Design a protein. Structure first.
Lengths: 124, 49
């Protein structure tokens, strides 16, 4: 805002922030969710995420890591994180066991800027 | 134990794919069996002598 510069924000990682409140929510008296997460997950996550957004004054190029316990994408913690992102890079244990790195599964991931108008048509 | 259900679901979907694969082998087999049964109607004559 004040300096007007562009910024990077590397975060390693969001899931520890989620479980940090999960360890406390049961002690506060808050009843937990299905898998054993707080019920305030999506709200606290959004109130953290929405601060991360480009503005008229500057720009935040954020990058976020996530822990998928058991490689289960159906875990609600990564699942709620889809909506608050523009490029959902996904990694998998399978591709790494084949000795390939970066262990990317191109089909299970996709971006938002993948349009002909934002980038070159040949790239699309 | 969220892993055991994924292991069993994955085995189920694997067999479900394997079913249509073997069904495709079946239909491809019948495509050539219908072609080759015609020999049965015209069988047992070329070595009569």
């Amino acid at each position: 805002d004040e300096a007007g510069q562009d910024v990077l924000l590397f975060v390693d990682n969001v899931f520890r922030f989620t479980q940090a409140n999960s360890e406390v929510s049961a002690l506060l008296g808050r009843i937990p969710a299905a898998v054993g997460y707080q019920p305030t997950l999506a709200e606290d996550l959004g109130m953290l995420q929405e601060r991360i957004t480009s503005t008229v004054k500057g720009s935040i190029t954020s990058v976020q890591a996530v822990y998928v316990p058991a490689d289960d994408i159906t875990d609600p913690a990564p699942a709620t994180t889809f909506s608050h992102l523009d490029a959902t890079t996904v990694l998998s244990r399978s591709v790494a066991e084949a000795g390939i790195y970066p262990a990317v599964e191109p089909l299970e991931c996709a971006s938002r800027i993948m349009d002909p108008d934002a980038i070159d048509v040949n790239h699309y | 134990g969220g892993g055991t259900i994924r292991f069993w679901r994955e085995k189920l979907e694997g067999y479900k794919k394997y079913h249509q694969i073997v069904k495709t082998i079946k239909m491809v087999t019948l495509a050539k069996y219908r072609q080759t049964v015609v020999r049965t109607r015209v069988r047992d004559q070329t070595l009569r002598y």
